[PDB]
Nucleic acid binder design. Structure first.
Lengths: 62, 59, 122, 106, 86
RNA sequence: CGUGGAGGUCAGUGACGAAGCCUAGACCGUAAGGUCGGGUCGAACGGCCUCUAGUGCAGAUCUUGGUGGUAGUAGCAAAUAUUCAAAUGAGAACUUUGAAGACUGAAGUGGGGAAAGGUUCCACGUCAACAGCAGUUGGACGUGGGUUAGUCGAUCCUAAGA
């Protein structure tokens, strides 16, 4: 479909950038219907959208 | 469909004003009604009624 | 109505036309003169082979400084190309004409293209 | 004819002389060419885990040999490929050197 | 400017119809000449209510919109039902 | 010899087809020109005696409009770079998701404003034209929603000056 809007709102609700949200690829037609921050708050709650942890920058060599 | 001038030309100087406020209330509720209804022909009659009263009042 | 010069019997025939198309006049004239005169199924097979670069279209009049190929021998030239847009438009109009002939109730195994013509839109 | 074989594609000699910017985008086409030659098909699909192992080390770091596994299958409805296709996949081996070509049983 | 010129129309978009529900806030359209005193007065006198505050904004189309909040002793749902629109 | 208009006459031609236009079909005159036939077409128009003039073009690097050859030709080569699968769709190198590979590298390809712009913001639908290939995409196209202040600005003060 077109989940551009859902990506934007999900990234704004979780508190990360658009490069750290994971929209599940098997449940596309559930995110197609989530058009409110409440629905997205439900999807992040149950697990269809996750947060994609931060890339490491180690300081062992330093 | 409205008031008549030779009717209005004898009424007292107070029933005229009360008629005015009645017609203005009618228009006020009619706007809220037209906020949903497709098209209403009572508006063109009530405006000209208001005006035909105000003419005699002024006179 | 009022097609160009067509000497034939109008009872055993079908027509098809398209106007104001966003194609190239120079490229479409060649892919029309290529199938001009062939049979219907043979022409459709040919146009299907051109889209896979198995066969070519001889560019005979609008052919300045285009390159030579080895697929121009079948026809007797060296210059040839593969206009995809024009081939697609022509092989749509051909299917329209075939359906029209079937409607009129003509025998599809005997159909040859007897008239085909292109010119310029505004 | 449904069948499944294992292959070793010598990828060193098919990239010799190519520009550095286009080595990993070209092993892709070389593998599709390989599979078309061998399985005789026309539709070739690569598992997305073969893409990872082709691009593991960047554009200009493709391996020398790859151990593959090809399967000829029957295609489904709304097909124009009459009716076969190939599915290429990677296999896991210590080295990719010294292996002949075998037939996998199902 | 009578209180029939002051209050012109109610606003009935489904974004506005949620403030009357949750926020307890009547959205109105008033005249470009009214001020936050006259709006308060006209509402209080037409519907016998307790106004807590009025906010206003001049829209891009040209008119002026009012956000009239009521006190905890009234119900904008019922008042809008009396006016008719819900 | 031919052209636009004016006076007189031929009780002139005409929807059973006036004028115009096409015609390696025909007849007359040294020529300028005139007259017929056939095709198209649809409402007015000629011969003779005279009056009158914004009265006849191949050129003026002439004016306005339209059209060719060159020519499918020169060209679409800055900013290191893309690949696999699925989904939607009539249709996918270019839309959406997931996976991998790179880039800007805090004097940023990031986050805000002043002036200026004026609805470009958001949602839904949609592809005739436009975004120098494409397109299901779009700041495009159609229809609606959206800007809340006793404390942030103006408002008040005066500077160069009027």
């Amino acid at each position: 479909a077109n989940l551009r809007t859902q990506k934007r709102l999900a990234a704004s609700v979780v508190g990360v950038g658009k490069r750290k949200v994971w929209l599940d690829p098997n449940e596309t037609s559930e995110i197609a219907q989530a058009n409110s921050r409440n629905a997205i708050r439900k999807l992040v709650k149950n697990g269809t959208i996750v947060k994609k942890a931060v890339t490491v920058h180690s300081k062992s060599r330093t | 469909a409205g008031v008549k001038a030779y009717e209005l030309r004898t009424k007292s100087k107070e029933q005229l004003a009360s008629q005015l406020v009645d017609l203005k209330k009618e228009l006020a509720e009619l706007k809220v009604q037209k906020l949903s209804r497709p098209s209403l022909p009572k508006i063109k009659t009530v405006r000209k009624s208001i005006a035909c009263v105000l003419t005699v009042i002024n006179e | 109505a009022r097609y160009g010069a067509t000497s034939t019997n109008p009872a055993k025939s079908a027509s098809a036309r398209g106007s104001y198309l966003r194609v190239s006049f120079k490229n479409t004239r060649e892919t029309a003169q290529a199938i001009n005169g062939w049979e219907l199924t043979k022409a459709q097979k040919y146009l299907e082979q051109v889209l896979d670069h198995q066969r070519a279209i001889p560019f005979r009049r609008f052919n300045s400084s285009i390159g030579r190929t080895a697929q121009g021998k079948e026809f007797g030239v060296t210059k040839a190309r593969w206009p995809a847009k024009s081939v697609k438009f022509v092989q749509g109009l051909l299917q329209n004409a075939a359906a029209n002939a079937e409607a009129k109730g003509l025998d599809a195994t005997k159909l040859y293209v007897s008239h085909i013509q292109v010119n310029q839109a505004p | 004819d449904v069948v499944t074989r294992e292959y070793t594609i010598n990828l060193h000699k098919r990239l010799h002389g190519v520009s550095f910017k286009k080595r990993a985008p070209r092993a892709v086409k070389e593998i599709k060419k390989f599979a078309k030659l061998h399985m005789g098909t026309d539709d070739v699909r690569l598992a997305p885990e073969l893409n990872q192992a082709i691009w593991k080390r960047g554009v200009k770091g493709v391996e020398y040999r790859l151990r593959l596994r090809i399967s000829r299958k029957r295609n489904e409805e709304e097909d124009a490929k009459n009716p076969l296709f190939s599915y290429v996949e990677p296999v896991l081996v210590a080295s990719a050197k010294g292996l002949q070509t075998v037939v996998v049983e199902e | 400017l009578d209180s029939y010129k002051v209050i012109e129309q109610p606003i009935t978009s489904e974004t506005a119809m949620k403030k009357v529900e949750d926020g307890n806030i009547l959205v109105f359209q008033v005249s470009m000449k009214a001020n936050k005193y006259q709006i308060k007065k006209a509402v209080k006198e037409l519907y016998e209510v307790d106004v807590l505050k009025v906010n206003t904004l001049v829209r891009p189309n040209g008119t002026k919109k009012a956000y009239v909040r009521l006190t905890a002793d009234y119900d904008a749902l019922d008042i809008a039902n009396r006016i008719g629109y819900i």
